[PDB]
Enzyme design. Structure first.
Site, PDB file in Angstrom:
ATOM      1  N   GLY A 182       0.837  -1.178   0.000  1.00  0.00           N
ATOM      2  CA  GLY A 182       0.000   0.000   0.000  1.00  0.00           C
ATOM      3  C   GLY A 182       0.875   1.232   0.000  1.00  0.00           C
ATOM      4  O   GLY A 182       1.621   1.460  -0.957  1.00  0.00           O
ATOM      5  N   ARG A 194       0.050  -9.796  -0.573  1.00  0.00           N
ATOM      6  CA  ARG A 194       0.265  -8.356  -0.643  1.00  0.00           C
ATOM      7  C   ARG A 194      -0.541  -7.730  -1.772  1.00  0.00           C
ATOM      8  O   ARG A 194      -0.999  -6.588  -1.646  1.00  0.00           O
ATOM      9  CB  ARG A 194       1.755  -8.066  -0.809  1.00  0.00           C
ATOM     10  CG  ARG A 194       2.612  -8.746   0.249  1.00  0.00           C
ATOM     11  CD  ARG A 194       3.843  -7.935   0.618  1.00  0.00           C
ATOM     12  NE  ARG A 194       3.690  -7.274   1.910  1.00  0.00           N
ATOM     13  CZ  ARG A 194       4.566  -6.421   2.427  1.00  0.00           C
ATOM     14  NH1 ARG A 194       5.684  -6.107   1.792  1.00  0.00           N
ATOM     15  NH2 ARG A 194       4.316  -5.875   3.614  1.00  0.00           N
ATOM     16  N   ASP A 242       6.913 -11.957 -11.134  1.00  0.00           N
ATOM     17  CA  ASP A 242       8.253 -11.817 -10.582  1.00  0.00           C
ATOM     18  C   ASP A 242       8.950 -10.626 -11.221  1.00  0.00           C
ATOM     19  O   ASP A 242       9.061 -10.546 -12.449  1.00  0.00           O
ATOM     20  CB  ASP A 242       9.070 -13.089 -10.809  1.00  0.00           C
ATOM     21  CG  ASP A 242      10.490 -12.962 -10.298  1.00  0.00           C
ATOM     22  OD1 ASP A 242      10.679 -12.388  -9.206  1.00  0.00           O
ATOM     23  OD2 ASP A 242      11.417 -13.431 -10.987  1.00  0.00           O
ATOM     24  N   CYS A 297      13.591   0.196   3.324  1.00  0.00           N
ATOM     25  CA  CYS A 297      13.230   0.525   4.697  1.00  0.00           C
ATOM     26  C   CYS A 297      14.272  -0.016   5.670  1.00  0.00           C
ATOM     27  O   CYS A 297      13.941  -0.523   6.743  1.00  0.00           O
ATOM     28  CB  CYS A 297      11.843  -0.015   5.041  1.00  0.00           C
ATOM     29  SG  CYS A 297      10.524   0.580   3.960  1.00  0.00           S
TER      30      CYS A 297
END
Ligand SMILES: [Mg+2]
Ligand SMILES: [Mg+2]
Ligand SMILES: [Mg+2]
Ligand SMILES: [Mg+2]
Ligand SMILES: [Mg+2]
Ligand SMILES: [Mg+2]
Ligand SMILES: [Mg+2]
Ligand SMILES: [Mg+2]
Ligand SMILES: [Mg+2]
Ligand SMILES: [Mg+2]
Ligand SMILES: [Mg+2]
Ligand SMILES: [Mg+2]
Ligand SMILES: [Mg+2]
Ligand SMILES: [Mg+2]
Ligand SMILES: [Mg+2]
Ligand SMILES: [Mg+2]
Ligand SMILES: [Mg+2]
Ligand SMILES: [Mg+2]
Ligand SMILES: [Mg+2]
Ligand SMILES: [Mg+2]
Ligand SMILES: [Mg+2]
Ligand SMILES: [Mg+2]
Ligand SMILES: [Mg+2]
Ligand SMILES: [Mg+2]
Ligand SMILES: [Mg+2]
Ligand SMILES: [Mg+2]
Ligand SMILES: [Mg+2]
Ligand SMILES: [Mg+2]
Ligand SMILES: [Mg+2]
Ligand SMILES: [Mg+2]
Ligand SMILES: [Mg+2]
Ligand SMILES: [Mg+2]
Ligand SMILES: [Mg+2]
Ligand SMILES: [Mg+2]
Ligand SMILES: [Mg+2]
Ligand SMILES: [Mg+2]
Ligand SMILES: [Mg+2]
Ligand SMILES: [Mg+2]
Ligand SMILES: [Mg+2]
Ligand SMILES: [Mg+2]
Ligand SMILES: [Mg+2]
Ligand SMILES: [Mg+2]
Ligand SMILES: [Mg+2]
Ligand SMILES: [Mg+2]
Ligand SMILES: [Mg+2]
Ligand SMILES: [Mg+2]
Lengths: 109, 246, 338
Positions: free
Chosen positions: C139, C163, C191, C264
RNA sequence: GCCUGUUUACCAAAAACAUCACCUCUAGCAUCACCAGUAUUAGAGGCACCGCCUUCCUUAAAUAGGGAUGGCUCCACGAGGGUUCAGCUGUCUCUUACUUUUAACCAGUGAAAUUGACCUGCCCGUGAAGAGGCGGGCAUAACACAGCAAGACGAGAAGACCCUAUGGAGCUUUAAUUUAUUAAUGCAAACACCUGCAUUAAAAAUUUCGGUUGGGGCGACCUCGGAGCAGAACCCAACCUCCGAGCAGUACAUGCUAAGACUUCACCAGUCAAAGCGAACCUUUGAUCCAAUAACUUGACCAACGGAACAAGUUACCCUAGGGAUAACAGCGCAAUCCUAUUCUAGAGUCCAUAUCAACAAUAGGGUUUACGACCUCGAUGUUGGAUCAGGACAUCCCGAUGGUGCAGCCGCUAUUAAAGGUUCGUUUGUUCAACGAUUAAAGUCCUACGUGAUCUGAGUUCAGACCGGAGUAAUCCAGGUCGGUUUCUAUCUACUUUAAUUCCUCCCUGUACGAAAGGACAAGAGAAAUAAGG
RNA sequence: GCUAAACCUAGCCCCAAACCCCACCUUACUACCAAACCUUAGCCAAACCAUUUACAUAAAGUAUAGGCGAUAGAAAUUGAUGGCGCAAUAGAUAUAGUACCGCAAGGGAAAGAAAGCAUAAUAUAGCAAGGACUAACCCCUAUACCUUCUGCAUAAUGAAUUAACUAGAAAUAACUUUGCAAGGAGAGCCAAAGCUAAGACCCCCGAAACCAGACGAGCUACCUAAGAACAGCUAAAAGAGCACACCCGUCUAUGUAGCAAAAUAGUGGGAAGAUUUAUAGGUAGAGGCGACAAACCUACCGAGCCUGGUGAUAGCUGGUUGUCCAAGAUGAAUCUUAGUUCAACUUUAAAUUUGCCCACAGAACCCAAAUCCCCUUGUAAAUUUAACUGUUAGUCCAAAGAGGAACAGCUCUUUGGACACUAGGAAAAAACCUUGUAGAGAGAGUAAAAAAUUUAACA
């Protein structure tokens, strides 16, 4: 590292081969996707299983396939065919055996 | 016995054990199929076919009132008070061929059975019996050998009171004023002419009805039946008489 | 199998294992900033509120400003040169009220890490530009890209059907039927490593948010912690997957097109070595040149809302701080010159 | 290890236990211990007397030995554990003689384990994979007596070790469940003592140890579904190859009823559905009980996903019942690995393929390693080394005979043939190996249940004791280091118990051949030894 | 012809009936000095275990209770002398609670009226026999039995041998045969041909354990009381030295059913002390005692012994006894894979009617072998009803695959065959080939069935 994959078979396929006598409501064939299409006096369930709508003899035939126009993907597939090409499919029919009733003398008024 | 294992050793698990899998008889949810089964009232059926058969073979005398005692004595029905039998229910089976004029006392009666009985010129009344009174009625001789004074017949439980006070059931506690109306209604409904039993020469017999607190026709509560010397001892104490009349 | 052993390992929980890995690596990486980054990571996370451009945007912005949050995005494009994400001031720990369905029938705002919006603002979404999200399907950045304009086409891909279903859920919740049904939104589960072959030189703006160690969530949640002792092999192969995905994105982007590599994690290995190795591999195995674009102006523009580690030569690193617990977020802008 | 002491009665006497000394904690007190005591006392725990500070040597050879609160200091002692000088010795080189016992024969008396029956041979092959008994050969009158210990997977304990059991038991805990009982408190109850009820502890008590997989780890998995294996009705496993899911979106007839059918190989459960009635005009997870709700209905986990309502670690102190259906040594398969031989020349070999060596490969053979399998044996067989005695193969280490040579001679290198014979002694180490020392003609590679413990030994390893280091909350544990630690058998059967030397050195030939020299032969012969065999 | 064999009453079992001089609690059997009462637990069942279970008839296995599950379970009411026994391994343990064993609690017998040998050792060769034969052997054929296993001559288990003893107990529902029959039954119960009666069917031995109550500290551990011993020398008031008695048990050898259920010989440690030791007393079992070795507590102590619960329990091992015939073989769930339940298979009985084989027609797109289905036909079986055990986590071979190493007598799935069943063959031979349905024959035709190969000149 490979898990799952222990699901058993669904026992699907034809339940009534050609010529078998079938009463109304009998399931003729269960399929995962449309291997056999419903013909005359053959209905389709939610899960695409074919059941007899009348009491008769099961027949398998090959017929030209013209999908419902609201079936957009099938219509596009047809739109991409050449002029001479005609799609075909296997259809299952029930040839009804008995007449749907007879007139009887009830009272000689 | 096989070869080794629990089955040859003689120690296989109990009946209903499924090797650890939750047993069939336990994985099914509990449902009240048999709740209160032992308190449900049971009524042995007496079809009009069976009644006519008994009358025809002379095992039940229609010239006298027919109550549960007469049915049992003729062996027309088998009552098991211990198995929560509360008496006999009339059953319409055989109504179309019933041709007997009878005064019959039962515990339940179908509308059609009442109709058949009345069309043949007879009378049917639904009379209640508590388990004790029912036992005494079904087998009086053993009771008389017990040497106890004849007890009072108890009243129906509250749930059964409306049934036995309703005239449409010919309840033994129902207002007799409403009986002619109900009989006429049945005659009209089932298309037969109601015979005026008052004109019948057996009208007295057809009218005889034991008192609601009376078990036997001619015996009152409190009497003691001395069968050894063919006598009936009757109490005279005022308290006993009041009790046995209440 | 040998049941009895002379000695067994301490049996750390995955959270503590992640802490130990971070302590032994980021301590060296950051010197004296590591304690601050550590306390920020271990403390609560500062959530920004991204209003839904497909809803009563003005009303929601007014409500948030009443809650005293301010749109850091609004007063940034002016200097950098539709997105509106409201965040509280430095030091404020006030939470945002949970999002609720709006009058139009869509969620008024999305509570998401404000740091997971800089890559979107740096990709430079120009009107009428085809956009790809190679693997980014939590998201977040995807919804941010969606809430950018009604005259743009975007594709989002992620190998994980779970996801993808999550993306679909947020789309049904926020994006209206008009945009969602339109081709503007095209979601797929393929992929990314083979995305170069699937589509080549097709997309103009690409976002490659490779699967990462997600350090904050790794320290927070024990479930599926990337640092569990058994899954060391997957942890070790993560760099290869990241390099391959970035290479696939660089292959799919048009010549002269732009990509943003996103992560991240604080790891220099996953931050700068990934981009350098991707450049090398895609310039040798494919003879395609890529230039890293400077974002120092972007750093200065967003210094007020975020704290950035300056020593990182390539890319930009939003490090978490107690004043603004918004990081981590590494993002690098790369223009394909050939 | 301070010391003298104590200990596993019956495998451990020790470094373990205790011990004076020291430290820490607890206790302010009397009429049954402590104690007829009172803080210099008593109880408990820890620690360890005491005292002071904060590559070389050894040997010839040396896996040995010695030396370059904490850190040290060993006075004395020790059946403790290592090393050593010198001596001593049958420990040994290398055994011999004698005496006694035993022994064998004679007389008397007279057991035990054991034992399916046995009219009880050898070789090769086979076989539930190790044969006296089966196949093919060979041998073969019958019996005592004395020896032997190769076989009878010999006899002894339903051995040792390993695995299993919804078998025990012990121990420890932050496993689960309790606090009945005590101790504290609190609240009532009786006006210090006591009863009831709570809470917290102490002490305990009861009970459990899921399954499948994983030898060098630090786990993975357990339910459902999709694809391949499984190509064409159905069905088909796995530690098999891949992928996905524990719902969402929608509406709120996504209602009620009901023919007939399908069905995940059982059941449970799960599917489809005409007609009819009623509104309108949908696309995966879990039972029962139990709870909650007036009910309709709803819930918790039951993911070990057919679901114990609630129970973990550990045992070498262990026990029982079993298991060769299940591990390790061994046997047996197999030959990946390993080893050997050929083919090819790439190639090196100063050039030179093939005197010699050799890549990539190919083809055969072997069964010596490391592995794999779980087929025999778990109803007394540890294992490794060593000792004793060896049988055999030849793929030869020496001795013998030959071909070639990058062999002038000597020398080597290589190959063919040859298994008659032979094939050392020491230091360290438990060692097989290995290194080292000194030799040798040489100190060969192997098989034989890694030959051989009813012939021996027990040094490593393995059982009960104890330390160091490490793991663990602890109990305990450990592929580690160390000190100690019970090795039974009277032989019934088979088998067996007396079957033309070798090498080396010296000399002669002869410092002759050969060779420029250096160096240095063959063949033949003599003498010395030494060993082996026989006396 | 020895040893032996045999025997019949000594008594016992189950019922009925009946209610059955002196000494001695001190050290018992010694003539005589100043104080009881108090829940059983646990095994076991629940397939563990924890609540729970486990110390007349009829109503009724009902109401009820219950991890609502294993299982537990009323009452109102009803009224009621004999032996198809044993007969000395039986029946009492019993000739006797004796002998004997144990410190003790306690355990607890026996018995009275063929085998093995000898007459008469033995003969090549072999599961000891069989076919035979004139003839014992010689010839030919022949791999003990039981159990456990896929498969055992197996070098897997058990067995010396004889005698005696030693192991299938029962319901629900069926079926069969009677009786009566819409009723049956000698109250209660059942009944839409049922009911009543009978017939048939459900083993033995074995743990380690747990708990209750006794008995044990004459051994050993420690302690209490009051005793005793310790030469000689050296040294001086000593947990001192050497070393006797004494105590111990270092090392070696012997012994290993021994002299000994821990010894002997030598060697060795202590030997005036924390010593050794006689006597009496004390501490008792989850306890004691312990200079902690899990040591000791009457030879076998990680928790004594005896009795009882107790015929504990055992999904584990072993055993399970006349003759003969017949049918009879390889998935799911499960604290479950050493077991069980359901299915499949299997057996019996019954009903009635199709069953198998089976051509044509028929069964999918995506991207081979064959299979399914059934007119005929060859055939005689199939389905259903009732009742029901047992087998049900096999082996090898051919074939298609997967894993492993295109190894394995390796591990998985599938088709088929064979084996766990006869015989012949391939050497011996579970799994390859031939072949099956059973007997006698001193007849005959056959089946499968025996390896083949020898090889280098050169213009
Ligand atoms: Mg599948
Ligand atoms: Mg058996
Ligand atoms: Mg069985
Ligand atoms: Mg000492
Ligand atoms: Mg000892
Ligand atoms: Mg001693
Ligand atoms: Mg000793
Ligand atoms: Mg030495
Ligand atoms: Mg001493
Ligand atoms: Mg003699
Ligand atoms: Mg052999
Ligand atoms: Mg033998
Ligand atoms: Mg002899
Ligand atoms: Mg055993
Ligand atoms: Mg089914
Ligand atoms: Mg489970
Ligand atoms: Mg399960
Ligand atoms: Mg196997
Ligand atoms: Mg044996
Ligand atoms: Mg040779
Ligand atoms: Mg070997
Ligand atoms: Mg040793
Ligand atoms: Mg030890
Ligand atoms: Mg060790
Ligand atoms: Mg040692
Ligand atoms: Mg010693
Ligand atoms: Mg010996
Ligand atoms: Mg001997
Ligand atoms: Mg139980
Ligand atoms: Mg009663
Ligand atoms: Mg007797
Ligand atoms: Mg005889
Ligand atoms: Mg045998
Ligand atoms: Mg056995
Ligand atoms: Mg035996
Ligand atoms: Mg004593
Ligand atoms: Mg003296
Ligand atoms: Mg002394
Ligand atoms: Mg002591
Ligand atoms: Mg100890
Ligand atoms: Mg110990
Ligand atoms: Mg004892
Ligand atoms: Mg038993
Ligand atoms: Mg047969
Ligand atoms: Mg279960
Ligand atoms: Mg089992």
């Amino acid at each position: 590292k490979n898990l799952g994959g222990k699901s058993s078979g669904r026992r699907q396929g034809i339940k009534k081969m050609e010529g078998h006598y079938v009463h109304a409501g009998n399931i003729i064939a269960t399929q995962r996707h449309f291997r056999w299409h419903p013909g005359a006096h053959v209905g389709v369930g939610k899960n695409k299983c074919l059941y007899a709508l009348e009491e008769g003899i099961v027949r398998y035939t090959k017929e030209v396939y013209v999908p419902h126009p609201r079936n957009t993907e099938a219509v596009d597939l047809i739109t991409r065919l050449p002029k001479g090409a005609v799609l075909y499919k296997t259809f299952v029919h029930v040839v009804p055996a008995k007449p749907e009733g007879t007139f009887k003398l009830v009272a000689m008024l | 016995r096989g070869h080794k294992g629990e089955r040859q050793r003689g120690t296989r698990p109990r009946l209903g054990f499924e090797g650890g899998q939750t047993p069939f008889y336990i994985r099914i949810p509990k449902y009240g199929f048999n709740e209160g089964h032992s308190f449900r009232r049971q009524y042995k059926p007496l079809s009009l076919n069976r009644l006519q058969y008994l009358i025809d073979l002379g095992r039940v005398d229609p010239s006298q009132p027919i109550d549960l005692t007469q049915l049992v004595n003729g062996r027309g029905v088998t009552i098991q008070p211990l198995k929560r039998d509360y008496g006999v229910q009339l059953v319409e089976e055989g109504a179309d061929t019933f041709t007997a004029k009878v005064n019959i006392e039962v515990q339940l009666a179908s509308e059609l059975a009442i109709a058949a009985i009345e069309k043949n010129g007879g009378v049917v009344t639904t009379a209640f019996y508590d388990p004790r009174s029912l036992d005494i009625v079904c087998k009086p001789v053993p009771f008389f050998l017990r040497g106890q004074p004849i007890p009072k017949r108890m009243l129906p439980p509250e749930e059964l009171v409306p049934y036995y006070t309703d005239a449409k059931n010919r309840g033994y506690l129902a207002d007799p004023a409403k009986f002619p109306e109900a009989r006429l209604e049945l005659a009209r409904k089932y298309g037969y002419i109601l015979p005026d039993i008052t004109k019948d020469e057996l009208f007295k017999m057809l009218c005889t009805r034991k008192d609601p607190r009376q078990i036997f026709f001619g015996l009152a509560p409190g009497w003691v039946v001395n069968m050894a010397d063919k006598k009936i001892l009757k109490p005279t104490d005022e308290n006993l008489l009041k009790y046995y009349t209440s | 199998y040998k049941k009895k052993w002379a000695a067994t390992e301490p049996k750390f929980p995955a959270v503590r294992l992640a802490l130990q890995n971070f302590d032994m690596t980021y301590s060296v990486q950051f010197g004296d900033l590591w304690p601050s980054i550590r306390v920020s990571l271990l403390s609560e996370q500062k959530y920004g509120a991204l209003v839904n451009n497909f809803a009563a945007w003005d009303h929601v912005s007014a409500k948030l400003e009443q809650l005293s949050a301010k749109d850091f995005v609004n007063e940034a494009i002016s200097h950098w040169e539709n997105l509106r994400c409201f965040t509280f001031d430095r030091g404020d720990i006030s939470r945002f009220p949970p999002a609720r369905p709006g009058s139009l029938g869509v969620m008024e705002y999305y509570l998401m890490d404000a740091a997971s919006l800089l890559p979107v603002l740096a990709l430079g979404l120009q009107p009428g530009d085809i956009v790809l999200d190679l693997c980014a399907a939590p998201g977040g950045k995807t919804l941010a890209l969606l809430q950018t304009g009604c005259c743009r086409n975007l594709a989002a891909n992620d190998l994980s059907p779970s996801r993808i279903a999550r993306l679909q859920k947020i789309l049904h919740s926020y994006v209206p039927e008009e945009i969602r049904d339109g081709n503007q939104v095209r979601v797929t589960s393929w992929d990314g490593r083979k995305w170069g072959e699937l589509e080549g030189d097709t997309y103009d703006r690409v976002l490659v948010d490779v699967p990462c160690t997600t350090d904050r969530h790794s320290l927070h949640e024990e479930e599926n912690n990337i640092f569990k002792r058994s899954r060391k092999k997957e942890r070790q192969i993560l760099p290869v997957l990241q390099v391959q995905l970035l290479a696939a994105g660089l292959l799919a982007t048009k010549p002269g097109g732009h990509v943003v590599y996103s992560t991240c994690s604080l790891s220099h290995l996953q931050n700068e070595y990934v981009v350098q190795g991707a450049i090398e591999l895609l310039a040798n195995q494919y003879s395609i040149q890529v230039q890293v674009e400077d974002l120092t102006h972007f750093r200065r523009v967003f210094m007020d809302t975020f704290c950035f580690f300056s020593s990182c030569q390539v890319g930009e690193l939003v490090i978490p701080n107690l004043m603004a617990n918004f990081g981590p977020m590494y993002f690098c802008k790369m223009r394909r010159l050939t």
